[PDB]
């Protein structure tokens, strides 16, 4: 009864892995604030849904501040941001 109610509530919301992924909260002037990426590192590369790269420069308690490696017109609020898993290398 109680656990079935929990499954009914969580079934409506989409399932997301917030440790490795995240959703954009606000995007503007080349800065993306994303909710999620719980296990992300500082200075770590990320990948946006449009294929743009980014770097996590601020790891705030609520969000992650990401500097966008391109034009921010390809990024909208609610887009999936994934973890590359490593710092930037050339």
């Amino acid at each position: 009864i109680s656990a079935v109610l929990e499954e009914k509530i969580l079934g409506a919301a989409p399932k997301e892995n917030l440790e490795e992924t995240g959703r954009v909260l606000s995007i503007g002037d080349g800065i993306a604030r994303v909710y999620g990426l719980k296990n992300i590192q500082a200075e770590e590369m990320v990948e946006f849904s449009s294929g743009l790269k980014g770097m996590a420069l601020n790891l705030e308690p609520d969000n992650v501040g990401i500097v966008v490696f391109g034009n921010d017109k390809h990024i909208k609020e609610g887009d999936i941001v994934k973890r590359t898993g490593a710092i930037v290398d050339v």
Partner: protein, 189 residues
């Protein structure tokens, strides 16, 4: 016009709690809205997935009010708490649903006149200690008062008794008493 709260609670979360208290006391649902809020807070603590879902700013408020409504029908909340949580999700204020509940608990504790007492002792004790401590704490009570006693253990105070009240505090413990005596030794001459 709002009914004055028994104690002042500050912040935006305290503003919502005083608004809910005033609405519940204008009607006759003070005890009802306290019961389901405590049961809601216990439900959120027992199921952290619900707390993460409500505090998620990505999810739309329609999904939040549906999840709130689905979990509040089992609480048998009728009119005030349903509108209270609908107001919290109408604004972006359900991120501190624990804050308003804790503030509302603080208002209702002073509604019953309960005063929080915190007594710290080096070692736990009962029987002779607990009997006299209850009477000693009851001597501070004005008529129409209740005692919420919380006992703590800490070996850093050597011994003695560190008893606190809602705003008053004394440090009649061995560790602090020998500390000021040694300070008097060093500052003697």
């Amino acid at each position: 016009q709002l009914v004055k709260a028994p104690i002042q609670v500050f912040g935006i979360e305290g503003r919502y709690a005083t608004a809910l208290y005033s609405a519940a006391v204008k009607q006759k649902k003070l005890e009802a809205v306290e019961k389901d809020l405590v049961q809601l807070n216990a439900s959120l603590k027992k199921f952290p997935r619900l707390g993460e879902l409500l505090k998620n700013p990505t999810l739309s408020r329609q999904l939040k009010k549906d999840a709130i409504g689905s979990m509040l029908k089992e609480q048998k909340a009728v009119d005030l708490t349903s509108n209270f949580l609908d107001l919290l999700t109408e604004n972006n204020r359900l991120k501190m649903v624990d804050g308003v509940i804790n503030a509302f608990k603080t208002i209702m504790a002073a509604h019953r006149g309960e005063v929080i007492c915190e007594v710290t002792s080096a070692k736990p004790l009962d029987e002779a200690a607990r009997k006299d401590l209850e009477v000693a704490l009851k001597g501070f009570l004005k008529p129409g008062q209740n005692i919420k006693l919380t006992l703590k253990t800490d070996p850093a105070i050597i011994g003695g008794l560190v008893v606190s009240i809602g705003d008053r505090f004394v440090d009649m413990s061995i560790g602090t008493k020998i500390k000021r005596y040694t300070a008097a030794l060093k500052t003697a001459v």
